[PDB]
């Protein structure tokens, strides 16, 4: 077999996710992301179903691969001496959240619900499959720009959903809720709720709004944009500062504020300008 079947293009990326370049399958021309990570690096290993030690990011990636789209499939991957090359889809053209919003700055509500909900359905997704993202930002969305469609990416901080308490976490601090600062303990889905409060004030706002742990801690949402009150209701309900008082998924996606969601294409075309 080998790396040959591969084209490698430009370096795409760079950071604790290891190096990402764009690349094309020699067989039929498909587009691709090759991911190089490095041994050394890797912290968290797991186990394939024939007892083959590989990083945790590919067993995560095994477990939520198949027909769905809300997440970037693993179609391949390589162990060379010193790394592990991932292989996986590249939607074109494409750009990632962090960067839209870099760019357009605060979404539209419209835009914004539509984003929104493709995430929620993306991590439901995963939870289904017995795997727990916890590093959900914007950074790690990348926006298929044709279709208007969201796609879930680096699964490098996740873990296998449990039931049971988590005491060790590696995504990024400011999504983080207020548990972990104080505790350093959480449970999966809470978690998770937390950082889809993070993120969707993130859409509507044009930024995080904690910097610091103090802010986390005291969970007080300051509003810098003009946002509607449901809008503002269902992020300070994700936001709340004890876990269970937090909405389950289907509490929010059964909150007045993510009804008559847009289908991705129509998103595109209204928004994406394509
Ligand atoms: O298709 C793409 C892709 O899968 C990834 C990716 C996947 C997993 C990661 O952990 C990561 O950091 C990036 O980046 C990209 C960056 C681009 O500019 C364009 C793309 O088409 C992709």
Redesign the pocket.
């Given at each position: 077999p080998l790396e040959s079947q591969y084209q490698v293009g430009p370096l795409?990326?760079s950071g604790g996710?290891?190096s990402?370049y764009?690349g094309i399958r020699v067989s039929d021309n498909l587009?691709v992301?090759i991911?190089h990570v490095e041994k050394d690096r890797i912290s968290d290993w797991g186990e394939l179903p024939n007892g083959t030690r590989v990083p945790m990011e590919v067993v995560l990636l095994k477990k939520v691969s198949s027909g769905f789209s809300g997440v970037?499939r693993l179609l391949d991957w390589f162990e060379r001496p010193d790394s592990f090359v991932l292989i996986?889809?590249?939607?074109?053209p494409?750009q990632?959240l962090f960067d839209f919003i870099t760019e357009r700055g605060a979404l539209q509500e419209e835009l914004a619900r539509s984003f929104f909900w493709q995430v929620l359905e993306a991590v439901r997704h995963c939870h289904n499959c017995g795997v727990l993202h916890r590093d959900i930002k914007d950074e790690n969305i990348?926006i298929d720009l044709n279709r208007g469609e969201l796609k879930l990416?680096?699964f490098?901080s996740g873990a296998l959903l449990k039931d049971t308490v988590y005491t060790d976490f590696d995504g990024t601090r400011v999504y983080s809720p207020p548990e972990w600062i104080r505790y350093h303990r959480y449970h999966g889905r809470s978690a998770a709720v937390w950082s889809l409060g993070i993120l969707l004030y993130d859409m509507v706002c044009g930024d995080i709004p904690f910097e610091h742990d103090e802010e986390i801690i005291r969970g007080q949402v300051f509003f810098r944009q003009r946002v509607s009150s449901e809008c503002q209701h269902l992020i300070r309900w994700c936001l709340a500062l004890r876990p269970s008082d937090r909405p389950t998924f289907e509490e929010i996606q059964n909150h007045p504020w993510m009804q008559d969601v847009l289908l991705p294409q129509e998103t595109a075309e209204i928004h994406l300008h394509s």
């Amino acid at each position: 077999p080998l790396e040959s079947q591969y084209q490698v293009g430009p370096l795409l990326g760079s950071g604790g996710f290891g190096s990402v370049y764009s690349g094309i399958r020699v067989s039929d021309n498909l587009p691709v992301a090759i991911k190089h990570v490095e041994k050394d690096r890797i912290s968290d290993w797991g186990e394939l179903p024939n007892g083959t030690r590989v990083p945790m990011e590919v067993v995560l990636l095994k477990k939520v691969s198949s027909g769905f789209s809300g997440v970037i499939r693993l179609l391949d991957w390589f162990e060379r001496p010193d790394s592990f090359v991932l292989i996986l889809e590249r939607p074109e053209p494409v750009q990632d959240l962090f960067d839209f919003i870099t760019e357009r700055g605060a979404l539209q509500e419209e835009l914004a619900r539509s984003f929104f909900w493709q995430v929620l359905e993306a991590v439901r997704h995963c939870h289904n499959c017995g795997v727990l993202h916890r590093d959900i930002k914007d950074e790690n969305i990348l926006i298929d720009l044709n279709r208007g469609e969201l796609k879930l990416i680096d699964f490098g901080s996740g873990a296998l959903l449990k039931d049971t308490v988590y005491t060790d976490f590696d995504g990024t601090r400011v999504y983080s809720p207020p548990e972990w600062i104080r505790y350093h303990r959480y449970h999966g889905r809470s978690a998770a709720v937390w950082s889809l409060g993070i993120l969707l004030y993130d859409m509507v706002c044009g930024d995080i709004p904690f910097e610091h742990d103090e802010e986390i801690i005291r969970g007080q949402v300051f509003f810098r944009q003009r946002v509607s009150s449901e809008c503002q209701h269902l992020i300070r309900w994700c936001l709340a500062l004890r876990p269970s008082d937090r909405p389950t998924f289907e509490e929010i996606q059964n909150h007045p504020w993510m009804q008559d969601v847009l289908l991705p294409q129509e998103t595109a075309e209204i928004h994406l300008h394509s």
